[PDB]
Amino acid sequence: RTKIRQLPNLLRGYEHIRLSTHNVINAENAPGGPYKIGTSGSCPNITNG
């Protein structure tokens, strides 16, 4: 339902790629009232959970 599938092939096109550091925006302070940040199993991390 979006073009998202090609994102890797897009990155591929470049010589130099890199995830960033930090964050382009604070989610909890965003407009619309304070937000708790959601997580879900099926997305485990270094630990688990």
Binding site: K3, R5, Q6, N9, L10, G13, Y14
Partner: protein, 56 residues
């Protein structure tokens, strides 16, 4: 020069652009081929016509 996929292409989204890419590739290969064929033809012409100096 090399002739590879262009990098902003995107198979799903822009096909038309892509079709034109294909077009430019094919056209290139053709032209360059003709040029080569010519170079060879000329070269062979020289090699065969040169075959009379020893006489002199």
């Amino acid at each position: 020069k090399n002739l590879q996929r262009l990098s902003g292409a995107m198979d799903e989204l822009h096909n038309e652009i892509l079709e034109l890419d294909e077009k430019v590739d094919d056209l290139r290969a053709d032209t360059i081929s003709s040029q080569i064929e010519l170079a060879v033809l000329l070269s062979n012409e020289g090699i065969i016509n040169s075959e009379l100096a020893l006489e002199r």
